[PDB]
Amino acid sequence: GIDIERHHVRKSQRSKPASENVYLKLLVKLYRFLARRTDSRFNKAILKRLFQSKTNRPPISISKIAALTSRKSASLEGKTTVIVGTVTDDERLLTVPKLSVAALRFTKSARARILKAGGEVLTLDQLALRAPTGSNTVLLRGKKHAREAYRHFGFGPHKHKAPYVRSEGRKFERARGRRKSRAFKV
Amino acid sequence: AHVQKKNPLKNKAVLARLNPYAKAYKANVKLNTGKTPKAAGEKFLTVLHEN
Amino acid sequence: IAKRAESYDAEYRKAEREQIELGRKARAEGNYYVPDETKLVFVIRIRGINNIPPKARKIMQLLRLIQINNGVFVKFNKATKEMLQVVEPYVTYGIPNLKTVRELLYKRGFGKVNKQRIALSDNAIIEAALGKYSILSIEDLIHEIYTVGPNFKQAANFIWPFQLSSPLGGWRDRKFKHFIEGGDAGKRDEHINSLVRKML
RNA sequence: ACUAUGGUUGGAGACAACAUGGGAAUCCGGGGUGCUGUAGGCU
RNA sequence: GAGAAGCUCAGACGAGUAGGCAGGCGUGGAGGUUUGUGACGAAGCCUUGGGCGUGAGCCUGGGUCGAACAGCCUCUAGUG
RNA sequence: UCUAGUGGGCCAUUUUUGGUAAGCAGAACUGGCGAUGCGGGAUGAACCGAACGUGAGGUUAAGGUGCCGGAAUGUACGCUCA
RNA sequence: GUACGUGAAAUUGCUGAAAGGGAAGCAUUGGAAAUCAGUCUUACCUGGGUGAGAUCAGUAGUGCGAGACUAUGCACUCUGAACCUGUGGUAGGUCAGCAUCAGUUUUCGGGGGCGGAAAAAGAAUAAGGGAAGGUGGCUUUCGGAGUGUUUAUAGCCCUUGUUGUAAUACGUCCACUGGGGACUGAGGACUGCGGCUUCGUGCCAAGGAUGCUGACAUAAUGGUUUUCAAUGGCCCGUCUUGAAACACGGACCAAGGAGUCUAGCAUCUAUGCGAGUGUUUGGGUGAUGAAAACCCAUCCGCGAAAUGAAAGUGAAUGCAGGUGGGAACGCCCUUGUGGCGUGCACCAUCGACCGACCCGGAAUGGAAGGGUUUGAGU
């Protein structure tokens, strides 16, 4: 008998994407080789994010990319922006800057606006060819907690979270337990 | 590499691979060439016997 | 490496001789010579993993005495002494000698390399693990453990706990009373060498 | 005194001894019977 | 090259009710595929023979039998 | 983040309360059974030892060495006739 | 053969085999009996004999260098090709034996160093001290029975001198050395660490077994079945703290037999599109043949704005703000658990904006100024 506590035994990380996309598997195979044969943490980060699920790869907008690379103390003038996910369009930005963006997929409107503005859109294999180690690359992520489920996660007394309500308005969870005039307020 | 563990205490070849000084190690060195006095002590003997 | 081992052997003989002459001088003069208290202690877990109080279980986990018949080298200070006092019924510890240390590290010497138990079959493994502490051989590791050098903590932690066998000839009649009472628990002083001899 | 840990220790039991550790109270005796900071007066 | 869903090296570990998860075995029907099996004998059944798998199970020799049946990738359920 | 089962417990050491007592009822600590096979106590859910993948070799724990039964009708000193 | 497609199990008769002293059934191991497996030594290749054969290396002509292949001819047989034999070689299972090894282990020795009261003793030797007597001697009395003094004809105890650095026992150590027994042989060209060397892709006990022999081959080794012997094994499921229970259900067998579908909701995952998304309420190709597939318009559902009971109002001071940690990247120091610069995501925090409330508040309006607050907001 051996007295060993088994707490951190099974790793909780994906070693393979759940998707059955053949092209995604081809990208994973390419970046498995890149991560193994290069000492750059960028390739490992890309390979890890290739395994991630849809919720763990939130979309990003060209306005967000433009805002992040146009900061005053940024010096990200001509650097290529890389996101492992979908790049969406933001119609609120009437004029699109010239951006070099590499992503898994592009919205038709976003890709058209980038090309019309004079930028370039690249896939991950193209990004690997141009920057095999990720040099001079701005790696970005979308907002993970921007989805609906995180408005309700952690709901409880005095947590200020959104309840699961069939409808919205009076007569729907706006009574005893929500205000002082009705017994108590949460 | 290292499919089988050899005991250096039994395999002299491994005992030579490790500890290169083992070739020149000399044991059973004699140092009683002197007169070999008897450092007993009168007080020590009296206390040792006592009652 | 050979020069270092020769110097270590000379140091061992010089220390042993110096203690002998000091004892003879005390006997001749009629006074009393109290030698240095031991700084190195070998601890063997004699109790299994059944019916262990939580405090003793935590202490044995911190001492890496997880399995029965497992042995470790520990520097002996106030904190270690109090820990051994609490786990007295479950372990036996004593003063190891040069033969015990070298035979343990030769026959049952395993190093923790990449969190794995690797046999110490070549000096290259020891250099790769403890090279930054000027430990370049198994003899250097033996010297560091035996003399409790400035890198004892790293050397002892690198050494995987020894997986000793059941003693040849067996234990005493009753194994789970104190060594003073006639059992095999608690401090046994130099008798740990004989216990390791029959357990190795 | 008491107490943590231990035994396939003793004793029918109450309890006691032992082993690795911690460790009083009370009584009695000895010694002592205020120190000190700030601001100012004093043959 | 070694189904990269692959190859190779090394270390530690292995009780389990209620319960959770994963990978597999078996059945009916549907799509695709196998110049797939079959009246020179399909399915089924019996066996004092053989083989494989830890196992769910599978293959095969012999006897009876007489008209349909199966392997692989998926779909599905009144599936053990 | 989501969800299952559970929401009757019991035994032993130690510290106890209520009881004449109880294989009684109720509290505290720890280890267990429940869900724990295995060696021992002739037997046994909790006691001792020890926590279990399939095997070979060696050595032990608790426990034993007259026969059943594997192992000294061993060694040394005494006591005991029921 | 109408008791009729095939024809299971429960149950039953005959035959054959086996076993059986108040259960049987099962598991491990072996024995006995019965039964099954090997085609080993096949196959590539070559040694040897003969026969015969339209014949091979290097070539020559017929895509510009190198190379490959096909075809036409030369090369005319010490070479290359088909073809037959030898119980041709390496023969190949199964079982063993013995050596040299490697790993693990058990058991019996021998030698040496060191340590202690540099063991304690003790023997032989020189100088002592003592009292118990060996009583040597003395003495009732020629056969004892007792003395009362310290070696007489014996001998003990305690001190120091040497030989003597005495041995022995014990403890500890030797990278000192001899045998005996058992189990294991995992890996499969090479690389590594070591030792010896004549200095060499040399040798070795050095990152895991090889070598030399023999017997059988209707034997042996395995596999299966029955039975015997040794040891162990309580009747399954269920409720239960606890079941073998004198707790319940269960005589046997075959077939059937129990978390499904739908309207929702929540988490997670995959797919498509993405500030949008959803063709199937509906219309057309459509008659041929069209419950499918394909195409098509306007509504609308959800989302893009919240807040308040409501009347209503309705989200940028700034780089859509500051602070700390923080992925990735770039620049240096030199190896650091190193500094510098921005800084995705996420969390914590200080603010700003919108709605509500509480204010002051300079007919109708609440513009500016606020707040210990409040919202499922920006």
Swiss-Prot record, chain A:
Component of the ribosome, a large ribonucleoprotein complex responsible for the synthesis of proteins in the cell. The small ribosomal subunit (SSU) binds messenger RNAs (mRNAs) and translates the encoded message by selecting cognate aminoacyl-transfer RNA (tRNA) molecules. The large subunit (LSU) contains the ribosomal catalytic site termed the peptidyl transferase center (PTC), which catalyzes the formation of peptide bonds, thereby polymerizing the amino acids delivered by tRNAs into a polypeptide chain. It comes from Schizosaccharomyces pombe (strain 972 / ATCC 24843) (Fission yeast). There are 2 genes for eL18 in S.pombe. GO terms for cellular component: cytosol; cytosolic large ribosomal subunit; preribosome. This is Large ribosomal subunit protein eL18B. It comes from the Eukaryota. It is found in: Cytoplasm. The modification Phosphothreonine is found at residue 133. GO terms for biological process: cytoplasmic translation. GO terms for molecular function: RNA binding; structural constituent of ribosome. Pfam families: Ribosomal_L18 (PF17135).
Curated annotation (Swiss-Prot), chain B:
Residues 1-51 are annotated as: C-terminal-extended nuclear localization signal. It is found in: Cytoplasm; Nucleus. Component of the large ribosomal subunit (LSU). Mature yeast ribosomes consist of a small (40S) and a large (60S) subunit. The 40S small subunit contains 1 molecule of ribosomal RNA (18S rRNA) and at least 33 different proteins. The large 60S subunit contains 3 rRNA molecules (25S, 5.8S and 5S rRNA) and at least 46 different proteins. uL4 is associated with the polypeptide exit tunnel. uL4 interacts with its chaperone ACL4 and the nuclear import receptor KAP104. There are 2 genes for uL4 in S.pombe. Component of the ribosome, a large ribonucleoprotein complex responsible for the synthesis of proteins in the cell. The small ribosomal subunit (SSU) binds messenger RNAs (mRNAs) and translates the encoded message by selecting cognate aminoacyl-transfer RNA (tRNA) molecules. The large subunit (LSU) contains the ribosomal catalytic site termed the peptidyl transferase center (PTC), which catalyzes the formation of peptide bonds, thereby polymerizing the amino acids delivered by tRNAs into a polypeptide chain. The eukaryote-specific C-terminal extension harbors a nuclear import signal and delivers the ACL4-uL4/RPL4 complex to the pre-ribosome, triggering uL4 release from ACL4 and incorporation into the 60S ribosomal subunit. Belongs to the universal ribosomal protein uL4 family. This is Large ribosomal subunit protein uL4A.
UniProtKB/Swiss-Prot annotation, chain C:
It is found in: Cytoplasm; Nucleus; Nucleus, Nucleolus. Disulfide bonds: none annotated. GO terms for cellular component: cytosolic large ribosomal subunit; nucleolus; nucleus; preribosome; ribonuclease MRP complex. The modification Phosphoserine is found at residues 7, 194. Keywords: Cytoplasm, Nucleus, Phosphoprotein, Ribonucleoprotein, Ribosomal protein. One of its GO terms (molecular function) is structural constituent of ribosome. It comes from the Eukaryota. GO terms for biological process: endonucleolytic cleavage in ITS1 to separate SSU-rRNA from 5.8S rRNA and LSU-rRNA from tricistronic rRNA transcript (SSU-rRNA, 5.8S rRNA, LSU-rRNA); maturation of LSU-rRNA from tricistronic rRNA transcript (SSU-rRNA, 5.8S rRNA, LSU-rRNA); tRNA processing. Component of the ribosome, a large ribonucleoprotein complex responsible for the synthesis of proteins in the cell. The small ribosomal subunit (SSU) binds messenger RNAs (mRNAs) and translates the encoded message by selecting cognate aminoacyl-transfer RNA (tRNA) molecules. The large subunit (LSU) contains the ribosomal catalytic site termed the peptidyl transferase center (PTC), which catalyzes the formation of peptide bonds, thereby polymerizing the amino acids delivered by tRNAs into a polypeptide chain. Belongs to the universal ribosomal protein uL30 family. There are 3 genes for uL30 in S.pombe. Component of the small ribosomal subunit (SSU). Mature yeast ribosomes consist of a small (40S) and a large (60S) subunit. The 40S small subunit contains 1 molecule of ribosomal RNA (18S rRNA) and at least 33 different proteins. The large 60S subunit contains 3 rRNA molecules (25S, 5.8S and 5S rRNA) and at least 46 different proteins. This is Large ribosomal subunit protein uL30C. The lineage of its organism: Eukaryota, Fungi, Dikarya, Ascomycota, Taphrinomycotina. The gene is rpl701.
